[PDB]
Amino acid sequence: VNLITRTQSYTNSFTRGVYYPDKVFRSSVLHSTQDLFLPFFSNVTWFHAINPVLPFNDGVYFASTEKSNIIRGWIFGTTLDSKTQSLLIVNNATNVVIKVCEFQFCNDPFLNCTFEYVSQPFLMKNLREFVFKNIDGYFKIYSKHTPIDLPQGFSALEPLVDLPIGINITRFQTLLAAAYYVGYLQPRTFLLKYNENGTITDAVDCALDPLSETK
């Protein structure tokens, strides 16, 4: 069955997509880090769904402004036809199911391996932001839920899990039961500003314009 189709548009990322680079507390200091970040004022893609496979390209910035219990998770890997190791992340009910064990599965959910990772689900006008990256065989996921279109405000994303998978990922898709935003991360140097409570309240993308290079 191929009931799900989608259309594309382009929009501005603004200053969204800044996560904590490490779980180390720093208060009232400017820290110059260098990691895979979403570039400032980049070109993110708005997908309206009512379905080709998307490229990974060194981490994915994901966002949604829809209602709850609409996106049922994600699928990562290369071929995703129960042949090679396909990472299925099903985020529904009261238990997330993360497995490297491949399974033949259609684009739309209804209504060789044995690794079954389980944890708390990644769920709860409101905007949901995620960052996925794969470094040295480890899958790192950052998330943020905030009440608010991508706003002009500044928000920080917190890490959730570490997954020592070790497979090579180049393609991915999302899962449904409306619209979402897809970004792409690049290796860049950021200047993060920590407030009195140790929250990243501002940041400067160094390689954007010469004023930020001077900063």
């Binding site: 904590y20 180390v24 917190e158 497979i167 090579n168």
Partner: protein
């Protein structure tokens, strides 16, 4: 002793620093009780092939690395980021035991930064490999008189292997420009070949079993600790502490620092630890250094007298210990304060001068 002379002239000389010594030793580790199953890894019958290398994650247990000598007949460790003797103290977050079988001439391949056929197509280590490599001869188990063909290795690949990547896929290698169509033949090479293992071979081609212990030495919440025993917590006292393998000396106090729940350590501008999280009872502690300061000796010449005064720089007199006058430059001990004002003889601080006057004593004014 500071001046390296037996004669001291009149004036003020900065000599040394007083420091409050630590009183008690504090060792703190999480109360985990399990034992890490290194016996299943080392005391195994058949290791997997190098193109399908085993990777077992060890977690939530007390790790004792001294039993590996009894478990395996290996001669010595090869540890890169740590020392094998010091492995029984510091606590790790995660540890991964990789396991495979190679021959003897390619053990130098499996090292951080090294290249070769195995290091480029079979098993690649990261540049920053903070772990240990254990390799022992297995000529009595992995060698066969007729040739042990169970162990296979990768020869050809379209690109080099990224670090910590298991290439399990078995397709044909298209050496030529023509499409091989999945059929082996001319310029269509099967990339996996067998080790030839015989007891008649030399030491270079003899089978070696390798277990690689990769430590995830991080600031994440640690769960693979050593066999060290945790002591009790002591606050508001200069103590020598060891928190999760992090050694130091300071005064631990209760702090209202708002750590996020994923954060464990707090750093400073000088990349030094300023605040820690207690692993047994989840409390937040600031680490101030123990009290110190500068010590100056204010004296006349040794031809005059052997009586001195001591100035503690920037120290309130109510906290002076490790007459008494209080200056803006610190606390002065051994000089009487006189309400009269004379010319300056030995300068001390913000408008304070000391001299040797009237029997005879050191006065400050």
């Amino acid at each position: 002793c500071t001046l390296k002379s037996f004669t001291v002239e009149k004036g003020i000389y900065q000599t040394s620093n007083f420091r409050v010594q630590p009183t008690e030793s504090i060792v703190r580790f999480p109360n985990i009780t399990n034992l890490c199953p290194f016996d299943e890894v080392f005391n195994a019958t058949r290791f997997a092939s190098v193109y399908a290398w085993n990777r077992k994650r060890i977690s939530n247990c007390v790790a004792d690395y001294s039993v590996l000598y009894n478990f395996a007949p290996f001669f010595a460790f090869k540890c890169y980021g740590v020392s094998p003797t010091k492995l029984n103290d510091l606590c790790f977050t995660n540890v991964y035991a990789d396991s495979f079988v190679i021959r003897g001439n390619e053990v130098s391949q499996i090292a951080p930064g090294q290249t070769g056929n195995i290091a480029d197509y079979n098993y690649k280590l990261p540049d920053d490999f903070t772990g240990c490599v254990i390799a022992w001869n297995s000529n009595k188990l992995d060698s066969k008189v007729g040739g042990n063909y169970n162990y296979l290795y990768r020869l050809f690949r379209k690109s080099n292997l990224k670090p910590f990547e298991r290439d399990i896929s078995t397709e044909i290698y298209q050496a030529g420009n023509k499409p091989c169509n999945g059929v082996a033949g001319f310029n269509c090479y099967f990339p996996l070949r067998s080790y030839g293992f015989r007891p008649t071979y030399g030491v270079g081609h003899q089978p070696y079993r390798v277990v690689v212990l990769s430590f995830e030495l991080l600031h994440a919440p640690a769960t693979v600790c050593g066999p060290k025993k945790s002591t009790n917590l002591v606050k508001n006292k200069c103590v020598n502490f060891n928190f999760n393998g992090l050694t130091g000396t300071g005064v631990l106090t209760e702090s209202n620092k708002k750590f996020l729940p994923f954060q464990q350590f707090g750093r400073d501008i000088a990349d030094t630890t300023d605040a820690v999280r207690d692993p047994q009872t989840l409390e937040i502690l600031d680490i101030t250094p123990c009290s110190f300061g500068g010590v100056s000796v204010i004296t006349p010449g040794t031809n005059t007298s052997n009586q001195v005064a001591v100035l503690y720089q920037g120290v309130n007199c109510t906290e002076v210990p490790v007459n008494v006058f209080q200056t803006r430059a610190g606390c002065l001990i051994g000089a009487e304060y006189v309400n009269n004002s004379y010319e300056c003889d030995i300068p001390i601080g913000a408008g304070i001068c000391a001299s040797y006057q009237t029997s005879q004593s050191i006065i400050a004014y």
